[PDB]
Amino acid sequence: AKCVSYGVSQIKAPALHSQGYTGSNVKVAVIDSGIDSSHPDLNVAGGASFVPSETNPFQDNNSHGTHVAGTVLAVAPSASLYAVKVLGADGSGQYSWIINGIEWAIANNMDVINMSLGGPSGSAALKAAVDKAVASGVVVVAAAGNEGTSGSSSTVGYPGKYPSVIAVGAVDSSNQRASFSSVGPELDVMAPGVSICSTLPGNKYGAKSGTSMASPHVAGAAALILSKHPNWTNTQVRSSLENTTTKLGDSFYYGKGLINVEAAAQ
């Protein structure tokens, strides 16, 4: 048994794959619950755990990080993946552990950071870490959140909500916003996040829904762009992904729209 996200095709990733652009030599840090390196489909280049109770980043006791990693790889097959364990088995983590995982990514010369995580409040320490990663040349991508709507108020969670961080919302197979997808002015792009079939611990596969599922489609898109245009800065990658979107509806709901990697890559 095996599956691939339908989101691979929807973002126009196969068009770059056929041209020989598969994310080669790009360093992607998945800052999540760890990654089950033992999966036949997953290749992990390295990593680190900052969860005092779970020392092994190569062990995923939750399943979240393994599912997210598999999405990164389905989009950009040649990318060097790094397991940055900041959340435990329950899917929770301390802000300081998240910070230490961002700092690890900066020191270790990561190209792309994926953060399929969020909370309702931010910290000064958290915005300095994400802004330092952007100052250092890093492409920082995060899930917008699964908060739905609250009238006219933004429901985007942190670190997604910070301007330096690419906030990714969720669409289904028909380009429609998922009911759970967070809204607001801080929402940047849309990616497929409804019933994403990816890898799970102990040679398994299954479907998950969330903004957490949308995010890695964008981090894998960033890796594809960098494999074709090695000289391009994080700002240039961001601009290209944002400026080449398939426009869907109001910006409050959909941001700039759906990412189009074939367009973005020029």
Swiss-Prot record:
Instruction: Summarize the activity regulation.
Output: Completely inhibited by phenylmethylsulfony fluoride (PMSF) and partially inhibited by benzamidine hydrochloride, leupeptin, and pepstatin A.
What is the activity's pH dependence per the UniProt entry?
Answer: Optimum pH is 9.0.
Q: What is the effect of changing residue 21 to F?
A: In strain: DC-4
Q: What is its subcellular localisation?
A: Secreted
Name the enzyme's class.
Answer: hydrolase
Per its Swiss-Prot or TrEMBL entry, what cofactor is needed? Ca(2+)
Binding of Ca(2+) 1 occurs at: 2, 41
State the family named in the UniProt similarity comment for this chain. Belongs to the peptidase S8 family.
Listed name of the protein:
Subtilisin BPN'
Taxonomic source organism:
Bacillus amyloliquefaciens
